[PDB]
UniProtKB/TrEMBL annotation, chain B:
Keywords assigned: Electron transport, Membrane, Mitochondrion, Mitochondrion inner membrane, Respiratory chain, Transmembrane, Transmembrane helix, Transport
GO cellular component, one term: mitochondrial inner membrane
Electron transport recorded as keyword: yes
Source organism of this protein record: Sus scrofa
Family from the record: Belongs to the complex I NDUFA13 subunit family.
Protein origin, superkingdom: Eukaryota
Protein location: Mitochondrion inner membrane
Assembly behavior: Complex I is composed of 45 different subunits. Interacts with CARD15, but not with CARD4. Interacts with STAT3, but not with STAT1, STAT2 and STAT5A. Interacts with OLFM4.
Protein name as annotated: NADH dehydrogenase [ubiquinone] 1 alpha subcomplex subunit 13
Role according to the record: Accessory subunit of the mitochondrial membrane respiratory chain NADH dehydrogenase (Complex I), that is believed not to be involved in catalysis. Complex I functions in the transfer of electrons from NADH to the respiratory chain. The immediate electron acceptor for the enzyme is believed to be ubiquinone. Involved in the interferon/all-trans-retinoic acid (IFN/RA) induced cell death. This apoptotic activity is inhibited by interaction with viral IRF1. Prevents the transactivation of STAT3 target genes. Complex I functions in the transfer of electrons from NADH to the respiratory chain. Accessory subunit of the mitochondrial membrane respiratory chain NADH dehydrogenase (Complex I), that is believed not to be involved in catalysis.
Gene: NDUFA13
From TrEMBL, chain C:
Family in the record: Belongs to the complex I NDUFA3 subunit family.
Membrane spanning stretches: 17-37
Pfam families per UniProt: NADHdh_A3 (PF14987)
Gene: NDUFA3
Assembly mode: Complex I is composed of 45 different subunits.
General function of this protein: Accessory subunit of the mitochondrial membrane respiratory chain NADH dehydrogenase (Complex I), that is believed not to be involved in catalysis. Complex I functions in the transfer of electrons from NADH to the respiratory chain. The immediate electron acceptor for the enzyme is believed to be ubiquinone.
Name of the featured protein: NADH dehydrogenase [ubiquinone] 1 alpha subcomplex subunit 3
Bilayer disposition of the protein: Single-pass membrane protein
Cellular component per GO, a single term: mitochondrial inner membrane
Domain of life the protein comes from: Eukaryota
UniProtKB/TrEMBL annotation, chain D:
Taxonomic source organism: Sus scrofa (Pig)
Protein name per its UniProtKB record: NADH dehydrogenase [ubiquinone] 1 alpha subcomplex subunit 8
Keyword terms, alphabetized: Disulfide bond, Electron transport, Mitochondrion, Repeat, Respiratory chain, Transport
Presence of the UniProt keyword Electron transport in the record: yes
Keyword Disulfide bond carried by entry: yes
TrEMBL record, chain E:
Keywords linked to the UniProt accession: Disulfide bond, Electron transport, Membrane, Mitochondrion, Mitochondrion inner membrane, Respiratory chain, Transport
Disulfide bonds: C32-C65, C42-C55
Compartments (UniProt record): Mitochondrion inner membrane; Mitochondrion intermembrane space
Bilayer topology term: Peripheral membrane protein
GO cellular component, one term: mitochondrial inner membrane
Protein's name according to its UniProt entry: NADH dehydrogenase [ubiquinone] iron-sulfur protein 5
The keyword Hydrolase belongs to this UniProt entry's keyword annotation: no
Region described as Disordered: 84-99
Family: Belongs to the complex I NDUFS5 subunit family.
Domain of life per record: Eukaryota
Subunit field text: Mammalian complex I is composed of 45 different subunits. This is a component of the iron-sulfur (IP) fragment of the enzyme.
Annotated function: Accessory subunit of the mitochondrial membrane respiratory chain NADH dehydrogenase (Complex I), that is believed not to be involved in catalysis. Complex I functions in the transfer of electrons from NADH to the respiratory chain. The immediate electron acceptor for the enzyme is believed to be ubiquinone.
Length: 347, 96, 83, 171, 99, 174, 115, 98
């Protein structure tokens, strides 16, 4: 693509997301989702292989279906209230339609099937954008309409997301599919506390985006998309694999790392609401994510896999480009737990 | 030439609109009496139709507010002939 | 000087359609902002009485509202009659 | 709930102004000139009260003023008025511009026989004022009392007592 | 909005189409203008939680105005009870209701 | 003549059942344009003259037209027919009977509760009683796009330009 | 409704002309008579001949231009506003964006019927 | 609610079911998407005209133009898939299972 055209398409994706987050009118929110999808489709097809084309097609189908359901929910809400302002929904079935549409856009468990395939089918930069920036708009809408969501529907979808992200990621040797299933589990963690405290959702989203940015930038730095290709990285740049190991430990929520903060805060906020069984289930289920994170860490940094003879060529060469803000992303994703009370700034 | 003519066509429209404005109090006064008469005739009829419906109470406003509410077509023509209510609904739309 | 004149020469010699279209579009962009008549068009649109001019109750101290349509008070369309 | 109170049928009876749209349009300018008092008074009532039932007698006076206006037209040159509104009636848009000759001799009647000058362009569209005797409606919307507002915030900000108090943190 | 840029910058980006009692072209009124106005003036500045119970009457009247459900029920009852007495030869609709 | 919007809406739903049972896409498009025509008629009966003519000119003569044009290029060697599958017949028949059952229930009961509460007391009944004056309220509301809807015009025009750029990015095929 | 009667009459008379046109002639048909016409020989079916991205691209660009035209149609009533400077700014804005779409398609190959 | 609204919402439900229940062709699913948009347009138009929400008269125009932009995008995606496989069959879009 033309660098100017790619910059414009990226800016249009972000501007659709911003239109979603700054509008008080449902039509403009729908417009923002539309603009985001329109600009997003070409960045998925940037490399243009049949895998990229299929990933873009599946993404388009799911997002367009969700957008039509969202518009139908808006129209039912208007039919019963005459209201365009994004606020509590005045109709229950419109609320159900909207919740399902937003979950399908996010990729929650009953609508999760697109996330692994699309993430695998696109490049690591496209996947980084897909699993970080594309979560903002639906989650912001959900935080705005949280006072009218059905807690049972939302909590069901979140628990299923955690379970499926844990189980699906257990079987993966592809790094992009592992990232997608980790993303499903983390979206479940975000959406479980959404009925109770949207500040916890924002906190968890920020921590997850930091970890995902760090991990995807480490993968791009490594040029690895399979677990065996990553197993060669120690023999080229062991610093990258050790940083990746501490980041994976953070993703598993191991104290004293930054990834433990969202789980701990969400468990506390849930127990404040007489919710004890669900947090226990969620914390226990996250051990699956931690298991395949630990498998990746074993294959990458904690042990040394066989290398190749052609790796001696790569030793005499440096990186042409350097990932921006990667050291900051790594420090933020691992070391920020002592700063937890600053979460009140998100209030 | 089009400037001259379109400028003249704007004053003619102002004159027509002012003729309508002068006529409007008559039409408003007439429409009020017509609507009120239709509503009251419906009321007098439903006092007869609904005598035997047990818990029915005739004239009972559907709204909490006692403020005047402009009636729909159903309240006005719901007891009249199909031709009349068809006219009152679609006569303007269908007039070509 | 000669560079822009030569470019206009080449465009007029090979793409007269684009020259005419860009000149027409540029004038359509520019001319309204210089016209004394644009304000007149705004005034004509404002003087068109679509709605009923529902009156006011003179609580006293309303010396500029007419009373009657033919009283020397309220806006006048004498300007529009000669334009 | 509650009974919609309605006027009776004889509360709604009036001498109708039974002339057609072309007759009404032909006299409309002189009608606005000569019948402004009760017309504007009734329109004031209708917008002030937002109730057809509150302004019936004002509309009844509107009707009477129109009736007497037309009876004044009838006795001096019913004939030029008849020609003018016939010519207005012919055209399918009831245009004034096709009948200026007939409007001319209708207008130079009412001047000489009745004194009626025809309003100029824009005069009939003016917002005027009416000196009514009817009291100003107090609650035209029949509004309920509005809910009491949540108490405002008073006082000066003091630092959080013992800080965040989040678990083990001391600040 | 999640980020109320409009209220910080004083811009009206989409609030003008947000209700039917907002300013309209040529001052054409919404069908439920008074009902929406009364509900909005009741519910203003007391929060949605309070407004859901303490402005229930205004919102009910508004919803009835929008979708005349109870009005339609009452009209349907009058219609079908009229027929319930045409068959038996009980009720004769009067001349002004037949022509 | 008494009921016109109801026949139009029933035909609308019938066409929806027809093209959503998914025969070969040319017959699906034919059903879609029949549905669009009857829906344009529906909104014409409600006073939406400009909106219905927009349906016609841009949906049926634009978007559809383009759809049928593109189907005429990417199709099957023997472009399929409705009859070729028993699945199409089954889906269309089930949709038609679920239309008939629910319209009969609503007509003879007027208090169905399929997801939403419904009352087939008529369709003229909900119309309000008033004068719109010397203008079409719909046209005045839509012409407000340039005075009231500045933000809407900005975002829609940007999205259309982006759409051109996007289509040219995707279809290049490299 | 007059318009409905007019449409009914037009459609009915067109279909009647079909019926006379397609049933009145005397027929005698054999296999080689109704064979597809190919200038004296038989046509090849081949496999999905109507191809090439250019036919689809002109359709898509017409679709997007038609959408902007849909945005331009309310213009005759838009000139009747008191706020004429805003309306003129927005109408000219929409037309510049139409011109920009045309120019971008033009410069980036686009409208060309290439080799 | 009046029965026209019932039939319009029913049309939306039928289009949604037709889109969710796939068949071989991609164009059939895209036509179901278009039907969903058309039913949304008519529902919005009926609601807006009935309540005389005058400024909301422009909302169906915006919905139509944006949904047609999405339809153009989907058509381009279908054309790319067909150029890959000679058909628009969704069963060829399965190589991301591995
Ligand atoms: C960003 C800078 C991208 C760039 O270099 O664009 C050059 C740009 C496009 O060049 P190109 O060759 O067409 O495209 C190259 C590719 O981008 C591939 O080039 P690359 O391999 O260097 O890309 C690395 C990759 C990985 O990203 C990076 O290396 C940098 C971006 C991520 C970190 C910084 C952003 C997040 C900061 C806040 C984090 C939370 C606190 O960059 C991207 O994926 C960029 C995507 C578009 C920008 C927006 C990304 C947002 C991500 C975060 C979302 C959530 C934020 C919080 C809410 O060219 C210009 O002239 C501009
Ligand atoms: C509150 C606001 C706090 C920040 C105030 C402004 C600070 C300076 C702004 C400029 C800046 O740091 O740009 C970093 C910006 C970040 O990109 P990068 O890829 O991280 O650059 C690292 C290279 O080593 C860059 O190496 P280099 O050799 O290319 O350039 C050395 C670089 C020095 O670059 C740095 O020191 C890297 C940036 C360090 C700080 C980055 C984050 C700052 C904000 C705090 C984030 C953590 C918050 C933790 C708490 C969160 C809540 C608990 O300084 C400059 O390029 C000139 C700076 C003045 C213009 O880099 C550049 O502007 C140069 C490229
Ligand atoms: C340039 C300095 C300029 C200067 O004169 O500054 C005077 C300045 C005067 O402040 P002050 O309030 O008058 O005196 C201190 C108070 O008496 C005593 O503190 P406070 O009463 O003001 O309270 C501070 C407050 C708020 O404090 C905080 O939020 C930050 C906590 C540390 C602050 C102090 C050190 C910061 C700078 C050094 C960072 C080194 C990191 C090494 C990481 C190693 C990881 C294995 O602490 C709390 O609310 C709870 C404290 C216990 C929980 C800490 C975080 C738990 C979550 C993370 C678990 C992971 C393990 C623990 C953390 C990582 C280190 C092992 O003092 C300092 O800069 C030093 C303060 C030392 C506090 C230590 C608290 C125990 C925990 C950390 C000990 C282990 C790390 C080694 C730290 C010491 C060697 C680097
Ligand atoms: C790039 C986009 C540029 C758009 C044109 C610039 C603004 C045009 C204009 O006069 O807008 C007035 C309009 C309206 O202001 P107005 O002063 O014309 O008032 C209009 C009053 N009514 C609605 C009753 C007719 O500006 C806006 O609505 C601001 C919207 C955000 C613009 C952001 C541009 C970037
Ligand atoms: C307690 C929690 C944290 C626990 C983890 C702490 C750090 C662990 C680091 C990796 C440990 C496992 C691997 C051990 C084997 C040896 C290291 C290795 O894998 O590679 C060694 C290699 C050395 O590279 P070198 O040869 O020096 O390069 C010279 C230039 N060519 O490369 C390296 O040595 C790279 C080392 C990278 C270190 C990354 C550190 C990231 C941030 C750590 C935060 C720690 C937080 C502690 C608790 C805080 C609580 C608030
Ligand atoms: C107090 C209570 C104390 C309870 C103690 C007992 C339970 C906890 C301790 C479990 C210890 C064992 C962990 C798994 C070890 C392992 O390696 O198991 C064997 C097997 C190996 O799998 P793998 O390496 O992928 O095989 C590659 C083949 N080519 O592994 C597998 O095949 C995959 C196993 C994945 C899951 C491993 C365990 C995860 C953590 C346990 C909780 C699981 C989820 C619970 C929550 C509810 C979920 C519905
Ligand atoms: C609230 C009320 C309901 C609202 C929703 C509308 C319900 C009625 C309208 C139905 C619309 C069309 C439904 C069927 C759509 C369709 O095309 O289904 C295709 C599907 C599989 O097709 P295919 O894989 O091609 O089959 C093998 C071919 N050799 O076909 C099959 O799998 C076989 C069955 C075909 C017919 C199924 C009809 C089901 C309708 C109700 C369930 C869905 C809702």
């Amino acid at each position: 693509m033309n660098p100017i055209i790619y910059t414009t398409l990226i800016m249009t994706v972000m501007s659709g997301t911003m239109l979603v987050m700054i509008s008080s009118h449902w039509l403009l929110i729908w417009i923002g989702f539309e603009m985001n999808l329109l600009a997003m489709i070409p960045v998925l097809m940037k490399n243009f292989n049949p895998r990229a084309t299929e990933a873009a097609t599946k993404y388009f189908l799911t997002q367009a279906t969700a957008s039509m359901m969202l518009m139908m929910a808006i129209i039912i809400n208007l039919l019963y209230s005459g209201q365009w302002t994004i606020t509590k929904m005045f109709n229950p079935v419109a609320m159900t339609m909207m919740t399902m549409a937003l979950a399908m856009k996010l990729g929650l468990s009953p609508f999760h099937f697109w996330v692994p395939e699309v993430t695998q089918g696109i490049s690591l930069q496209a996947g980084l954008l897909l699993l970080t920036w594309q979560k903002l708009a639906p989650l912001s809408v959900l935080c705005q309409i949280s006072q009218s969501i059905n807690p049972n529907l939302m909590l069901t979808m979140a628990m299923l997301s955690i379970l499926i992200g844990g189980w699906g990621g257990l079987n993966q040797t592809q790094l992009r599919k592992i990232m997608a299933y980790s993303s499903i589990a983390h979206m479940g963690w975000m959406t479980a506390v959404l009925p109770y405290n949207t500040t916890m959702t924002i906190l968890n989203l920020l921590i997850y985006i930091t970890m995902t940015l760090a991990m995807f930038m480490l993968l791009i730095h490594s040029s690895a998309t399979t677990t065996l290709s990553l197993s060669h990285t120690w023999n080229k740049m062991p610093v990258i694999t050790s940083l990746m190991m501490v980041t994976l430990l953070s993703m598993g929520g191991l104290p004293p790392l930054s990834g433990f903060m969202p789980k701990w805060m969400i468990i506390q906020e849930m127990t404040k609401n007489e919710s004890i069984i669900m947090p226990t289930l969620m914390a226990m289920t996250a051990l699956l994510n931690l298991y395949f994170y630990m498998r990746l860490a074993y294959s990458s940094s904690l042990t040394m896999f066989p290398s190749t003879n052609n790796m001696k060529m790569k030793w005499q060469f440096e990186h042409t480009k350097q990932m921006k803000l990667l050291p900051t992303m790594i420090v933020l994703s691992t070391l920020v737990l002592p700063m937890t009370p600053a979460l009140s700034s998100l209030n | 030439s089009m400037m001259k003519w379109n400028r003249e066509r704007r004053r003619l429209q102002i004159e027509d609109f002012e003729a309508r404005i002068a006529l409007m109090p008559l039409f408003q006064a007439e429409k009020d009496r017509r609507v009120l008469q239709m509503l009251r005739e419906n009321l007098e009829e439903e006092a007869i139709i609904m005598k035997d419906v047990p818990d029915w109470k005739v004239g009972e406003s559907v709204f909490h507010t006692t403020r005047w509410v402009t009636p729909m077509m159903g309240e006005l023509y719901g007891l009249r002939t199909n031709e009349e209510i068809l006219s009152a609904t679609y006569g303007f739309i269908w007039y070509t | 000087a000669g560079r822009i004149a030569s470019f206009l020469k080449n465009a007029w010699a090979k793409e007269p359609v684009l020259v005419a279209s860009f000149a027409i579009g540029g004038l359509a962009i520019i001319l309204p902002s210089l016209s004394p008549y644009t304000n007149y068009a705004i005034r004509i649109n404002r003087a068109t009485p679509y709605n009923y001019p529902v009156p006011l109750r003179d609580d006293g101290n309303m010396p500029d509202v007419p009373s009657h349509p033919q009283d020397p008070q309220g806006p006048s369309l004498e300007w529009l009659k000669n334009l | 709930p509650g009974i919609v109170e309605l006027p009776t049928l004889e509360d709604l009876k009036v001498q109708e102004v039974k002339v057609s749209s072309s007759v009404l349009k032909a006299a409309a300018h002189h009608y606005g000139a000569q019948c402004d008092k009760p017309n504007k008074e009734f329109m004031l009532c209708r917008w002030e009260e937002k109730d057809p039932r509150r302004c019936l007698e004002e509309g009844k006076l509107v009707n009477q003023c129109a009736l007497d206006f037309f009876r004044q037209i009838k006795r001096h040159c019913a004939e030029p008025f008849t020609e003018y509104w016939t010519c207005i009636d012919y055209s399918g848009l009831q245009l004034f511009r096709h009948c200026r000759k007939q409007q001319a001799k209708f207008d130079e009647c009412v001047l000489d026989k009745l004194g009626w000058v025809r309003p100029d362009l824009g005069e009939l569209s003016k917002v005027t004022k009416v000196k009514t005797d009817r009291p100003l409606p107090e609650n035209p919307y029949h509004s309920r009392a509005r809910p009491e507002p949540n108490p405002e915030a008073e006082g000066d900000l003091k630092p959080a007592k013992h800080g965040s108090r989040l678990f083990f943190w001391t600040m | 909005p999640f980020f109320d840029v409009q209220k910080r910058l004083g811009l009206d980006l989409d609030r003008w189409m947000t209700i039917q009692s907002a300013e309209q072209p040529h001052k054409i009124p919404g069908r439920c203008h008074a009902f929406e106005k009364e509900w909005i003036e009741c519910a203003h500045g007391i929060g949605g939680i309070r407004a859901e119970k303490e402005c229930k009457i205004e919102f009910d009247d508004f919803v009835e105005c929008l979708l005349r459900q109870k009005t339609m029920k009452r009209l349907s009852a009058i219609k079908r009870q009229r027929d319930k007495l045409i068959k038996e030869g009980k009720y004769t609709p009067p001349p002004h209701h037949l022509g | 003549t008494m009921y016109i919007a109801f026949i139009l809406s029933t035909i609308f739903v019938i066409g929806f059942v027809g093209f959503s049972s998914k025969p070969s896409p040319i017959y699906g498009g034919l059903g879609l344009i029949v549905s669009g025509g009857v829906g344009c008629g529906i909104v014409l009966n409600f006073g939406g003259s400009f909106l219905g003519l927009m349906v016609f000119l841009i949906y049926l003569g634009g978007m559809l037209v383009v759809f049928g044009y593109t189907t005429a290029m990417a199709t099957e060697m023997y472009p399929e027919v409705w009859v070729s599958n028993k699945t199409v017949f089954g889906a269309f028949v089930s949709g038609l009977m679920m239309e008939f059952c629910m319209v009969y229930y609503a007509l003879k009961e007027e208090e169905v509760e399929i997801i939403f509460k419904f009352n087939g007391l008529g369709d003229w009944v909900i119309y309000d009683t008033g004068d719109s004056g010397f203008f079409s309220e719909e046209a005045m509301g839509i012409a407000a796009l340039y005075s009231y809807g500045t933000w809407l015009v900005i975002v829609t025009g940007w999205s259309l330009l982006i759409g051109v750029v996007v289509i040219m990015e995707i279809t290049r095929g490299n | 409704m007059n318009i409905m009667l007019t449409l009914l009459t037009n459609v009915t008379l067109a279909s009647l002309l079909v019926l006379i046109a397609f049933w009145l002639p005397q027929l005698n048909a054999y296999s080689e008579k109704t064979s597809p016409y190919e200038c004296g020989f038989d046509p090849m079916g081949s496999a999905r001949l109507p191809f090439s991205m250019k036919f689809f691209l002109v359709a898509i660009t017409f679709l997007l231009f038609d959408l902007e035209i849909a945005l331009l149609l309310p213009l005759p009533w838009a000139s009747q506003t008191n706020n004429l400077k805003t309306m003129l700014t927005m109408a000219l804005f929409l037309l510049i964006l139409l011109a920009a779409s045309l120019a971008y398609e033009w410069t980036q190959k686009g409208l060309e019927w290439a080799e | 609610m009046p029965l026209v609204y019932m039939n319009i919402i029913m049309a939306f439900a039928i289009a949604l079911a037709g889109l969710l229940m796939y068949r071989s062709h991609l164009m059939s699913s895209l036509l179901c998407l278009e039907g969903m948009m058309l039913s949304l347009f008519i529902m919005s138009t009926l609601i807006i005209l009935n309540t005389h929400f005058t400024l909301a008269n422009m909302m169906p125009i915006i919905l139509l133009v944006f949904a047609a932009c999405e339809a153009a995008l989907g058509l381009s995606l279908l054309v790319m898939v067909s150029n890959t496989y000679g058909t628009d069959y969704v069963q060829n879009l399965n190589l991301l299972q591995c």
